[PDB]
PDB file of N, CA, C and O and ligand atoms in Angstrom:
ATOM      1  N   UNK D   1      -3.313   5.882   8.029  1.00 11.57           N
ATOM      2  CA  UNK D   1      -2.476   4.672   8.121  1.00 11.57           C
ATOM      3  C   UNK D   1      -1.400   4.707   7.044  1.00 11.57           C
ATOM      4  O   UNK D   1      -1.769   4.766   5.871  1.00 11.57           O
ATOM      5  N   UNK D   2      -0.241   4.678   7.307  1.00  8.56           N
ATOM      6  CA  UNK D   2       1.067   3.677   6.753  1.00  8.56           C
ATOM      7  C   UNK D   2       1.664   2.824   6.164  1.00  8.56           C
ATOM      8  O   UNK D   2       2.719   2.526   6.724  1.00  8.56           O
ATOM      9  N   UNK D   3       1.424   2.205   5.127  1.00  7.03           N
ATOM     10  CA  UNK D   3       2.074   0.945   5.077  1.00  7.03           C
ATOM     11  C   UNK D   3       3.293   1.319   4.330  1.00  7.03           C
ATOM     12  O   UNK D   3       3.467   2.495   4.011  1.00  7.03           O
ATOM     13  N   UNK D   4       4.212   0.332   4.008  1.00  7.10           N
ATOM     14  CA  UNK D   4       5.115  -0.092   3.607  1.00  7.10           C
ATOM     15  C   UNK D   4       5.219  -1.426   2.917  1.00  7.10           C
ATOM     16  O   UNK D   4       4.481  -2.401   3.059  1.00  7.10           O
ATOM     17  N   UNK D   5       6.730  -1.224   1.806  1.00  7.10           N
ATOM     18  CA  UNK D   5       6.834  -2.427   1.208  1.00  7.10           C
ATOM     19  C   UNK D   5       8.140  -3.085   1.955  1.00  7.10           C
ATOM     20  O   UNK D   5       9.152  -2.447   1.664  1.00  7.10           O
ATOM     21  N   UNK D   6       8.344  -3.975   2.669  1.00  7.82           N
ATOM     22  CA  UNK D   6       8.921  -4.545   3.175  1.00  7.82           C
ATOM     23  C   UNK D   6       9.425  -5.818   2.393  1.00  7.82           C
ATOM     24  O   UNK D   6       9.644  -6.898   2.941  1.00  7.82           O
ATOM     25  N   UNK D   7       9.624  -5.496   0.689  1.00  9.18           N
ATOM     26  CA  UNK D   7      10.666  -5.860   0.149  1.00  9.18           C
ATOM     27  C   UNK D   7      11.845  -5.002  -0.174  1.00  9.18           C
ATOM     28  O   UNK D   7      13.018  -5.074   0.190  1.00  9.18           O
ATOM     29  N   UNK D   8      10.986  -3.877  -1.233  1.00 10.98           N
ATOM     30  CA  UNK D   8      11.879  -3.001  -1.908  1.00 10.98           C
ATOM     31  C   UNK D   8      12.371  -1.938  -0.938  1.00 10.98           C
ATOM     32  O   UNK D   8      13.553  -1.621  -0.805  1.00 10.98           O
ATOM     33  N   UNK D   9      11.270  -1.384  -0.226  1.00 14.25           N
ATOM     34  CA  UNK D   9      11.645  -0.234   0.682  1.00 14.25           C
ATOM     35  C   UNK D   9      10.563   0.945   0.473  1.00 14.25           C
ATOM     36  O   UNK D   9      10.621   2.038   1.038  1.00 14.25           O
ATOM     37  N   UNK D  10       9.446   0.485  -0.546  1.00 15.03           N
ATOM     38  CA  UNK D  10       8.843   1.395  -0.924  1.00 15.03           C
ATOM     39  C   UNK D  10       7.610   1.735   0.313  1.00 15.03           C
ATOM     40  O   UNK D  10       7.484   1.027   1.312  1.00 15.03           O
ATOM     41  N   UNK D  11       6.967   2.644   0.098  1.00 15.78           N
ATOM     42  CA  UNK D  11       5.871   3.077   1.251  1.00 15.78           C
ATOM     43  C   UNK D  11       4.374   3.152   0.665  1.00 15.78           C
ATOM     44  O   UNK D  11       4.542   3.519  -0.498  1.00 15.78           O
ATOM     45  N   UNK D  12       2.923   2.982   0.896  1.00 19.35           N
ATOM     46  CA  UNK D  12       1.840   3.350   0.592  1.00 19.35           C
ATOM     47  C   UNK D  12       1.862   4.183   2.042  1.00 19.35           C
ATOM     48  O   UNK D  12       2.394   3.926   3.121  1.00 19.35           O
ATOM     49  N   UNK D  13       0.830   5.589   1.455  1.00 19.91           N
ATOM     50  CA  UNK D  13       0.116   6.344   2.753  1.00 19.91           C
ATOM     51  C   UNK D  13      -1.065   6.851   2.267  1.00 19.91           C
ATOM     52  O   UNK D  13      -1.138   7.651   1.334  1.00 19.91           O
ATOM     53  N   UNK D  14      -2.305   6.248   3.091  1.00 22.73           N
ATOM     54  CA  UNK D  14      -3.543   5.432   2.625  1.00 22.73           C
ATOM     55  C   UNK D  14      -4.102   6.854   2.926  1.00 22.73           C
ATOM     56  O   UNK D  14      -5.309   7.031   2.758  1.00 22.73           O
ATOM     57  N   UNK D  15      -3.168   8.082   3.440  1.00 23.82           N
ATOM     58  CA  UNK D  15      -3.391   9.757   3.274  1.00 23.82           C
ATOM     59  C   UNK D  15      -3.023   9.769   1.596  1.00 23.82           C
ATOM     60  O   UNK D  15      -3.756   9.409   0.675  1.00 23.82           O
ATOM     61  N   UNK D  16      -2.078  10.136   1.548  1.00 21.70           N
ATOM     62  CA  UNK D  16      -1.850  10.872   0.088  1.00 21.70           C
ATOM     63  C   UNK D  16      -2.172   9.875  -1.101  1.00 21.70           C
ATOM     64  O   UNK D  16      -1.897  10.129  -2.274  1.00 21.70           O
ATOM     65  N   UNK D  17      -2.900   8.492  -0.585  1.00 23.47           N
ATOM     66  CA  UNK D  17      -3.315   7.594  -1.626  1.00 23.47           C
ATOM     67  C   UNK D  17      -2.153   7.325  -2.574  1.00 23.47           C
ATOM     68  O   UNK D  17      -0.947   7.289  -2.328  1.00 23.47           O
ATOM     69  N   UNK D  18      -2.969   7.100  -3.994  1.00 22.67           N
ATOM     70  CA  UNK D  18      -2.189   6.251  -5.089  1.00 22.67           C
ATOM     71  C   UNK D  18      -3.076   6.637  -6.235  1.00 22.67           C
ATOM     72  O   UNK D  18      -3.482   5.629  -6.812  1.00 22.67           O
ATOM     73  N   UNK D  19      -3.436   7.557  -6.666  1.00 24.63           N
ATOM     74  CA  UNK D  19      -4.235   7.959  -7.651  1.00 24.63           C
ATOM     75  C   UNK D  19      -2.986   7.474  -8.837  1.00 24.63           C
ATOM     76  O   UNK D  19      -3.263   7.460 -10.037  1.00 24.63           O
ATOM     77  N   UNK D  20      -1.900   7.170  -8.436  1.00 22.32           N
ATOM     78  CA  UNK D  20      -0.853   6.862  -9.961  1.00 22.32           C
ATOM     79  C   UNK D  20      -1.609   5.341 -10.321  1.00 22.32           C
ATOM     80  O   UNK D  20      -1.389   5.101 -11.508  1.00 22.32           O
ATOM     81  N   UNK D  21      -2.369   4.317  -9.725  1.00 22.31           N
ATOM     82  CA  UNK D  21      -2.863   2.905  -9.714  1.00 22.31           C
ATOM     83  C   UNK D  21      -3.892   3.353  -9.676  1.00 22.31           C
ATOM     84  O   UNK D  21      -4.543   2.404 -10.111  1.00 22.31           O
ATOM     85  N   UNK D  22      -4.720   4.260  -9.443  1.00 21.62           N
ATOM     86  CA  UNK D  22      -6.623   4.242  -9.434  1.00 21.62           C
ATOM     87  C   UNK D  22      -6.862   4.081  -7.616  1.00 21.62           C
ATOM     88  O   UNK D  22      -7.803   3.446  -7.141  1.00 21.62           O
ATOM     89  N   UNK D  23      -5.794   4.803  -6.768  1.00 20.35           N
ATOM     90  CA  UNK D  23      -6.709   4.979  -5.482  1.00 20.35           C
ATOM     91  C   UNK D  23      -6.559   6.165  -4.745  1.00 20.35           C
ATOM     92  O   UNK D  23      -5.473   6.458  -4.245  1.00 20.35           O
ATOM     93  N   UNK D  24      -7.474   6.814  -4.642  1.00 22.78           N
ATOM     94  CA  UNK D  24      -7.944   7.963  -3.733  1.00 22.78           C
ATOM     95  C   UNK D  24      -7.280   8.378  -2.574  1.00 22.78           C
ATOM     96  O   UNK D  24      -7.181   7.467  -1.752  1.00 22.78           O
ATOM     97  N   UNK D  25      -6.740   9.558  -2.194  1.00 24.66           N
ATOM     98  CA  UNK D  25      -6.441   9.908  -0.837  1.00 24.66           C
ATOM     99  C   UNK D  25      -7.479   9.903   0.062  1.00 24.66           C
ATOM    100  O   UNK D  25      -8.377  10.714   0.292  1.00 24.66           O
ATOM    101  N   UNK D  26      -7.071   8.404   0.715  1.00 24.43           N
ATOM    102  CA  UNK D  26      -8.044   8.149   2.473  1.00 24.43           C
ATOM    103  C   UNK D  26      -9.090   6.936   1.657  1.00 24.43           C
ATOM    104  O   UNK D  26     -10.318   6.937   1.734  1.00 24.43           O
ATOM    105  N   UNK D  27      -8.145   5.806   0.780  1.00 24.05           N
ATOM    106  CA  UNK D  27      -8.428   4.545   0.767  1.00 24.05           C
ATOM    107  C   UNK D  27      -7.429   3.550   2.051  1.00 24.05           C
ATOM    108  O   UNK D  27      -6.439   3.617   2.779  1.00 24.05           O
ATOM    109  N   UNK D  28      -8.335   2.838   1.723  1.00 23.87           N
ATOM    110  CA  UNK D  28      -7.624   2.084   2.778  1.00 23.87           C
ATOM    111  C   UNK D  28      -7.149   0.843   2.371  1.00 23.87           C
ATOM    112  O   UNK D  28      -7.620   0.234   1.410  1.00 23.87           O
ATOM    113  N   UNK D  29      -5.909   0.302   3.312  1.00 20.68           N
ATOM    114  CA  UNK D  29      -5.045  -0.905   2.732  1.00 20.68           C
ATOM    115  C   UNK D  29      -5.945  -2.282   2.191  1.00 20.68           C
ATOM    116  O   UNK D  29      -6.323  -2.434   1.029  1.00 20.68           O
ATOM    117  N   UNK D  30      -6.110  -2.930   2.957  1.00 22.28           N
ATOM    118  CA  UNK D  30      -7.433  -3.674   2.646  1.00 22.28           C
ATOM    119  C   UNK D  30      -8.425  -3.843   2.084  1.00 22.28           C
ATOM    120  O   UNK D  30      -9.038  -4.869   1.789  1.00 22.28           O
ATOM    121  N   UNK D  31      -8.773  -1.867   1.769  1.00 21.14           N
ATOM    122  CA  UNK D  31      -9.616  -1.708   1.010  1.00 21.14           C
ATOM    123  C   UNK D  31      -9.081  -1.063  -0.213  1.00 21.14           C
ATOM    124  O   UNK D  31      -9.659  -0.060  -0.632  1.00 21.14           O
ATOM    125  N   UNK D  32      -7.913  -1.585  -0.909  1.00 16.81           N
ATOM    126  CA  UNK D  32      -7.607  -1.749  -2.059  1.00 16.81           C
ATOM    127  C   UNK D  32      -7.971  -2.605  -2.863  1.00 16.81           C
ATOM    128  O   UNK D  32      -8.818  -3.420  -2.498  1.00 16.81           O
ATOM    129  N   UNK D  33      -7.502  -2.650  -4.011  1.00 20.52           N
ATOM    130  CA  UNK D  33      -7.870  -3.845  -5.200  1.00 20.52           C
ATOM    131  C   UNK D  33      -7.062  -4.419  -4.599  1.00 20.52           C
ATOM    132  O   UNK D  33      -6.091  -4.064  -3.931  1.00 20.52           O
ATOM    133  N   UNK D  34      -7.770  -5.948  -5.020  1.00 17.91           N
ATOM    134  CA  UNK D  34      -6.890  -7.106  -5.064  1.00 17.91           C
ATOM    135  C   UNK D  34      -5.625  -7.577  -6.014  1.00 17.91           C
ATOM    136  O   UNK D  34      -4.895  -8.569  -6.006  1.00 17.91           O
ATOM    137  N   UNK D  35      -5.701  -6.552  -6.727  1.00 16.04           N
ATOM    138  CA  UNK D  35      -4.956  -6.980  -8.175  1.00 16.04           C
ATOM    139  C   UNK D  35      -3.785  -5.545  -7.477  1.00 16.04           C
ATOM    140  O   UNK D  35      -2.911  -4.920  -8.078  1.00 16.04           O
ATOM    141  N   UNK D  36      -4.147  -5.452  -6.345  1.00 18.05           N
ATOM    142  CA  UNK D  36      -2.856  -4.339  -5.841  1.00 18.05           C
ATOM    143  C   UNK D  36      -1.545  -5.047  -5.641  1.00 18.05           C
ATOM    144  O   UNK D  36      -1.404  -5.999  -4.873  1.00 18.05           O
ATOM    145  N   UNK D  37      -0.357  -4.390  -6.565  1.00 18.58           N
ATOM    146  CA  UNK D  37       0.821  -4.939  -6.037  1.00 18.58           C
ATOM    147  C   UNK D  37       1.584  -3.828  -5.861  1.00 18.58           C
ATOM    148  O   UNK D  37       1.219  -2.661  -6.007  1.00 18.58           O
ATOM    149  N   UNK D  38       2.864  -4.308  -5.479  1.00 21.07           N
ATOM    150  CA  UNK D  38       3.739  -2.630  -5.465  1.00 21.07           C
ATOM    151  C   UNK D  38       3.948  -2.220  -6.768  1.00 21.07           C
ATOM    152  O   UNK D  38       4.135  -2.994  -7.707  1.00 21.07           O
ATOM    153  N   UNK D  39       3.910  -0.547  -6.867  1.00 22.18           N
ATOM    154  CA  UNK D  39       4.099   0.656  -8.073  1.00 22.18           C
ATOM    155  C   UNK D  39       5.678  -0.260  -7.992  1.00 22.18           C
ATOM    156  O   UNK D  39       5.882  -0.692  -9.126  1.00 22.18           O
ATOM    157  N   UNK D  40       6.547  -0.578  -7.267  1.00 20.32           N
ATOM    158  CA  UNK D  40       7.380  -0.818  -7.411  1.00 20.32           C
ATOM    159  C   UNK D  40       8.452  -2.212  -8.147  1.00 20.32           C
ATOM    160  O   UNK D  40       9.177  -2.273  -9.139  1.00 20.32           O
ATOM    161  N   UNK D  41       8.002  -3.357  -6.869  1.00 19.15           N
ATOM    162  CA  UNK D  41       9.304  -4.190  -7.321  1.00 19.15           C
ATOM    163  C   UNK D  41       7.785  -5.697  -7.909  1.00 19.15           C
ATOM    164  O   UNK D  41       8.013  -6.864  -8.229  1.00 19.15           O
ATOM    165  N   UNK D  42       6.432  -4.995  -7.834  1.00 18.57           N
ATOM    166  CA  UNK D  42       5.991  -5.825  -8.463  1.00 18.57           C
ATOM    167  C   UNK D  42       5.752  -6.961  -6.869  1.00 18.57           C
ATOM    168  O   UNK D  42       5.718  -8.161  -7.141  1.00 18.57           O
ATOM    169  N   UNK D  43       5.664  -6.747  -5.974  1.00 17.41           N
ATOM    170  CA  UNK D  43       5.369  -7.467  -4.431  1.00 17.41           C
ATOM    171  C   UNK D  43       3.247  -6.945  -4.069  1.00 17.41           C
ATOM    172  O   UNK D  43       2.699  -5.991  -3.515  1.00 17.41           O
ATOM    173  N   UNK D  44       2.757  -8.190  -4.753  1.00 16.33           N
ATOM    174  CA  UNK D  44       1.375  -7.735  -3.882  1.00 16.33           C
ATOM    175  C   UNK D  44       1.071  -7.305  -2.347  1.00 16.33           C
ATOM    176  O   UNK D  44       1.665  -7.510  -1.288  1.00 16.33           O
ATOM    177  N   UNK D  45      -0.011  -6.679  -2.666  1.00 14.56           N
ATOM    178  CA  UNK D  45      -0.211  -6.133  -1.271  1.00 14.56           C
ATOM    179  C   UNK D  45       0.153  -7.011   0.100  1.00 14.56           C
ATOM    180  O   UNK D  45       0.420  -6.372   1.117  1.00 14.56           O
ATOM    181  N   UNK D  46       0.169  -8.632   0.144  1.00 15.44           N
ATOM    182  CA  UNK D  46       0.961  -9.457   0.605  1.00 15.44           C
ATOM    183  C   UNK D  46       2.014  -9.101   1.543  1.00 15.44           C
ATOM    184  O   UNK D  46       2.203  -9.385   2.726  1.00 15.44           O
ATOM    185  N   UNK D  47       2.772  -8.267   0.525  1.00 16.59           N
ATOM    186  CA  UNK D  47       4.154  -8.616   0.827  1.00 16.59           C
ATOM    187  C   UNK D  47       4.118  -6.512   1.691  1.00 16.59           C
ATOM    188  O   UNK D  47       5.226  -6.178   2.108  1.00 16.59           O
ATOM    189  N   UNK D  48       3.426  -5.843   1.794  1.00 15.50           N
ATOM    190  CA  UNK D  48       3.738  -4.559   2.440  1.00 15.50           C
ATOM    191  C   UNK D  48       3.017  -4.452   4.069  1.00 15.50           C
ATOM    192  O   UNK D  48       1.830  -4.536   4.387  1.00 15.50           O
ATOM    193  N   UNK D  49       4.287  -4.226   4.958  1.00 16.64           N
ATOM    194  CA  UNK D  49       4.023  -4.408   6.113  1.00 16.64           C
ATOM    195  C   UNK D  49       3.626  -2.877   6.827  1.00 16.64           C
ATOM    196  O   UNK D  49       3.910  -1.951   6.067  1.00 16.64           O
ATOM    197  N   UNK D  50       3.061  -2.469   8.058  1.00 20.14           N
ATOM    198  CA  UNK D  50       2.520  -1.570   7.880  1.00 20.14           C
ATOM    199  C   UNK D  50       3.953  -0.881   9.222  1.00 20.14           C
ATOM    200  O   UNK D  50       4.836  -1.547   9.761  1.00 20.14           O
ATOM    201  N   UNK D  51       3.644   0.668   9.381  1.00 19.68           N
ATOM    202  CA  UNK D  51       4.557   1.414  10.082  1.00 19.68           C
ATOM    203  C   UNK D  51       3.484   1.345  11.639  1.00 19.68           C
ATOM    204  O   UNK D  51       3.514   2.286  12.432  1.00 19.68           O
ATOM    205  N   UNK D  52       2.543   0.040  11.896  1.00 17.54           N
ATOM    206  CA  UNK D  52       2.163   0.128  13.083  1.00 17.54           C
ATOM    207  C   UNK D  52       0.891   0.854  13.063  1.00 17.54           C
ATOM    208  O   UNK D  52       1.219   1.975  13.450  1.00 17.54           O
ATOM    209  N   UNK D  53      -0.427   0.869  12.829  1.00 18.72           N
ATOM    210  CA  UNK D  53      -1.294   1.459  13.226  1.00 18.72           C
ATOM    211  C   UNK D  53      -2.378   0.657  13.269  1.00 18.72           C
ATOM    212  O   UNK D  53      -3.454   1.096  13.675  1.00 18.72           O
TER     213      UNK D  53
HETATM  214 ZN1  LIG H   1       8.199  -3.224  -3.427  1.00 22.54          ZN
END
């Protein structure tokens, strides 16, 4: 799965993870922390819409 930040423009891919924040390649959106916001403009997980899956 895909997501996106549908403020800044930035992307999560719940493949190549986020080990830069503490998450694993083949976590999942939802099954992130709650205290997840964007690496970027600072938009919680809230605010990132997904590329459809
Ligand atoms: Zn952002």
């Amino acid at each position: 799965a895909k997501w996106v930040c549908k403020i800044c423009g930035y992307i999560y891919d719940e493949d190549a993870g986020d080990p830069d924040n503490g998450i694993s390649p083949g976590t999942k959106f939802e099954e992130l922390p709650d205290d997840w916001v964007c690496p970027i403009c600072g938009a919680p997980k809230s605010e990132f819409e997904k590329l459809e899956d």
